[PDB]
Amino acid sequence: MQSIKCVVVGDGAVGKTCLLICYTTNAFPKEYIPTVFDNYSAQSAVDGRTVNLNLWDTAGLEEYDRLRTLSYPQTNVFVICFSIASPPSYENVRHKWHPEVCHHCPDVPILLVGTKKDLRAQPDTLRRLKEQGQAPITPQQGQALAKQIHAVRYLECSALQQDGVKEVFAEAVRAVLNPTP
Template sequence: MKKKTCCVVLVGDQKCGKTSLCKAYLEGSWQKSTLGTTEYLPTIDATYKTNVEVGQKQIQMTIRDTSGQEAYDRLRPLSYTDCDVIAVCFDVGNPASLENVRVKWHPETIYCCPHSSTVLVGCKADARGTKRPGAATIVRKNECQQMAKTIGASDYVECSVLDESSLSHIFETIARVAKRQHKTKRTGWWRAVKRKIFSK
């Protein structure tokens, strides 16, 4: 039997936490002592493969991590090729990051891949429990859920690199959304065929 596959692209502002989310999930852990101590290195484009279990079935997931820098605005659309799900990420501790979901990331992704599903991902959710030095007002969860509705996201999920279970939940949610996306595509294809046959 052919193994089920899906492709997810992570997008969002620079330093919003999407690369940390990806690496912490793939490596299985994240050392708390390293947070805020390592030099920030911007992502240009990185692709990873992993297996995610959904309903006792393995899905081979391709994860593409993209740069949020404006300098890569023209290159980033290349990462959207054959994408099933867009994970639009933002920093829970930065309201401007959430607003950029509406003004930048949603317009870009809907233009580049209008038929892909979207999952809104709140990164650095541990900010809700502890006020980070110099951090802006924490975004309320109901505001995040409202933004998910505004952009037509299939789901809204939050995570922290300090909580491994929340990381797994993110990618399990993405895999389920991709599974529904594939089912919708198949159903839509068959309906189109039937319309063509019976309209003759």
């Protein structure tokens, strides 16, 4: 048994806790989860190797940043969840999320997760974002984030469809088990 502190970071209303509750507890949170932060534990396998995950559901608020930055130490992989429905969450990942996780953990591997890849094609999300003057995060856009901020991989998840959830966290683990070059 080998544990990885995978502090899942990411904005509010973008899908950290949705991805986690779909992962650790296997449920899609109906409403925006009021998050301070949590501790979970599951049993997952990574490319044929089973691993232990002691996980952290940190807050996306600007308020309890001191507590979330207390969570960043001991972290071995940073899961940054930003809404594809809200690419301003992608911009926040570019400005604060990745920079703060790196200021608290330099060179500690970071997974990049595009939450709600199922909405890149859903009419409501596209129409809302076009009315907001932005487009849902294309895999090239998240991949540009990943190359720019040295994310080990840019994944996408849809907690509504349970898409990529276990895949997201196995990749988070193998960001550490197999360090990316």
